[PDB]
Amino acid sequence: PRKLLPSLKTKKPRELVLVIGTGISAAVMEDSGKQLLQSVLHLMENGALVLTTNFDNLLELYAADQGKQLESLDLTDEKKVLEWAQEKRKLSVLHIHGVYTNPSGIVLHPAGYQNVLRNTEVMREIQKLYENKSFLFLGCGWTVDDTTFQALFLEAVKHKSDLEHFMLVRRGDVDEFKKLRENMLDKGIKVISYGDDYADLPEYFKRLTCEISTRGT
Amino acid sequence: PRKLLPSLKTKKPRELVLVIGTGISAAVAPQVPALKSWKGLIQALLDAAIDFDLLEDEESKKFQKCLHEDKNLVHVAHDLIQKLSPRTSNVRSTFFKDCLYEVFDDLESKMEDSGKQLLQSVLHLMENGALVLTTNFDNLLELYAADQGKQLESLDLTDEKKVLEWAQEKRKLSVLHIHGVYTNPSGIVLHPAGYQNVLRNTEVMREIQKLYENKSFLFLGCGWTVDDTTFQALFLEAVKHKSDLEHFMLVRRGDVDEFKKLRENMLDKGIKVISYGDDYADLPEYFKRLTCEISTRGT
Amino acid sequence: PRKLLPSLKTKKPRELVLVIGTGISAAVAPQVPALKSWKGLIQALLDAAIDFDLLEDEESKKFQKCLHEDKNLVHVAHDLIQKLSPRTSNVRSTFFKDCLYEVFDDLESKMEDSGKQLLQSVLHLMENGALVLTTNFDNLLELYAADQGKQLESLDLTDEKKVLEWAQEKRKLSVLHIHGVYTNPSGIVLHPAGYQNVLRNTEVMREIQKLYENKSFLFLGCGWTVDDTTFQALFLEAVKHKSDLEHFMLVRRGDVDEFKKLRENMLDKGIKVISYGDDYADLPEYFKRLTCEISTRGT
């Protein structure tokens, strides 16, 4: 009889920035993992962006399973990042630390974040994303507190009172929502529930995409 | 088949202000539990907060006990707003809105033509120039008007300009939800201090005194809106000179002494009563007979 | 069709003053059951009350006995007024005004041609310099006078001071009621309990010499126009000289002694009967011939 949080349920795929933590790579390939990445493929095709901390290329490889090819960016490829942030590069995925496929492209040292902080053109697009869009985060074992994320959004955008962003996490206690919620609402984001096992993350999120896209399209 | 009270039947659309009460928005639908009463409604706000995993087990059952009392459940909804909305007021939290959105949607899909005819009849008097105000949180009139006949705007008592134009009969865009309307939850004032702030201004109080003297008000479905707090504080306090020109109410006949008790009691408050004693599907048919009579005398 | 008793044509129109009965206001919609015979007025207020919730079915069955236990019927109407209008301090009470308008509404809808001839004739008789008095609450003779282009002044004795002008004959086209007036049912006084309290101004009763010997009455349609004692009380307390009372009544032929007796009583009182072959629409033409003969000899 389960339901999906309605304000996030109103959202239409162009509206969204999908930020992917390690927990989705952990949920993934298993047959339920291929059904998750099938859901990701539909979202990004319908005009969301996908971004990830993760160095893997599971998304680009799953695009080969269902008749597509998807392009990987790293934060040294500032030209393609500008075209991605301007919505022009459809089928382009960002890996924030970079992707294992490009060794010089990987950014980890503070100077890699500072290269984006120096790029006022891409930083203006980063502010613009956070002003315009609603963001959905997944599997936040690092992403919200990530030193790249903290440099890239958190130095750059101060509308932290005025956000309309959502997260998923699998709720085990009152304190787990609260404790998350306090730092999350200081960043500006709101918490949401699923709550039985990691198997709900594929199943819930596939029906969330179905309702988002069937309303939006 | 039934008569119209002739001093009411001969009134015109410019003269009137209508009130719709909670029973109507339920009665339109043969199959909506969640609006049948204030107890059905507060049951569904906890159903949303429970099923979305937004209220904890202890808090849910603690409020459920308080709601079992039947002791002013309308005021227990004030206590639920005090729990739900964070008072670090610069933070525009969504959660209260997300509760309400679960229940106050998928309404129209169930409905029947006799209910739609009631909404069209109400809209015809509003269009022809009546001002409408209502008890309810819902939007059924604004959805039904936006769909097939008018621009309809939903208003709460917080907005000084929009209430001033409503009092001046200018803002014929609007339907006035005295308490507050579910697609604007930040606006909701169940707690007295907000409508008491509308009492404070001397020129606004001239417009309010003028409003109660000038027109005839009709109430529908059940009229208990006379004593649902906000209505009493602004309108009823102003009886400095008890002119009380005719205002009118419908009721369903019951067993006869209940109707008698109401009739006597409200006629001393200032307000006249009329009966029907039939299947509720005839209540929309009766309201068509009254609607034609008023509107054809106006236009 | 047997013509004018030659007493009639002699009288110059400003000498006459008239009173209108039952069958006249019936003939201005004569298939409506509520006027066919005067018990029908209460039959219709009861048949309204069964649906319109003035009284229970058991109070209704008590009045059904009162319909079979007839005579006293005009003070049965006074007792029914005392049932339907005890009062608070002032205001506009729900049971009464807003129930009479089941029977004194929706007459004007049926002002047929044969009926309008009588009211037409009376109206020009008013313009020809008479004064007029009317039994009923009803306003037919006010409305079909504004149709021909004159807006009548209604009089009833609760408008206390205006008799100062009416006995001076100054308020031309003013019509003075008896069983009150439909535009202000508050004015009703069916009984010695009411009307004569105004006539405590005994200069009016003195000038009623000038209004009962120096001038001539004519009475339409009935016999009911005097045979319940109202047309003893408001007039015989001033004067009783049967030699020079100088007044008339229109009637119908029937079985011989049952026609004769009313002529015998009336002629002994000092009022003169006029009689023809019975049928309803002939009275309209009888009255117009009489009016043409009077108004031409008054020209």
Residue numbers in the entry:
A (entry chain D): 28 to 55, 138 to 326
B (entry chain C), C (entry chain B): 28 to 326
Sentences from the paper on this structure:
Here we identify family with sequence similarity 118 member B (FAM118B) and FAM118A—two understudied vertebrate proteins—as vertebrate-specific sirtuins with similarities to bacterial antiphage sirtuins. We show that human FAM118B forms head-to-tail filaments both in vitro and in living human cells, a feature that appears to be conserved in both FAM118B and its paralog FAM118A across vertebrates. While human FAM118B and FAM118A have individually very weak NAD-processing activity in vitro, their interaction leads to markedly increased activity, suggesting a tightly regulated system. As expected, the FAM118B sirtuin domain comprises the large Rossmann-fold subdomain and a small α-helical subdomain but lacks a zinc-binding module.
To perform cryoEM reconstruction, we treated filament fragments composed of several protomers as a single particle. This approach produced electron density maps of FAM118B filament fragments composed of five and two protomers, at 5.0-Å and 4.1-Å resolution, respectively (both obtained using a focused refinement in the last step), and of FAM118B24–334 filament fragments composed of six protomers at 7.8-Å resolution (without focused refinement) and two protomers at 4.8-Å resolution (with focused refinement). Despite the apparent helical symmetry of the filaments, an asymmetric reconstruction approach produced higher-resolution densities than helical reconstruction, similar to what was observed for another filamentous systems, likely because of structural heterogeneity within filaments. Experimental models were generated by fitting AF3-predicted FAM118B monomers into the electron density maps and refining them to a good fit. The part of each FAM118B protomer that is well resolved in the density maps is limited precisely to residues 28–325 for both FAM118B and FAM118B24–334, indicating that the flexibility of N and C extremities extends slightly beyond the parts truncated in the shorter construct. To assemble into FAM118B filaments, a part of the small α-helical subdomain (the head surface) of one protomer binds to the opposite end of the large subdomain (the tail surface) on a neighboring protomer. The large head-to-tail interaction interface (>1,000 Å2) is predominantly polar in nature, featuring numerous potential hydrogen bonds and salt bridges, along with several hydrophobic residues.
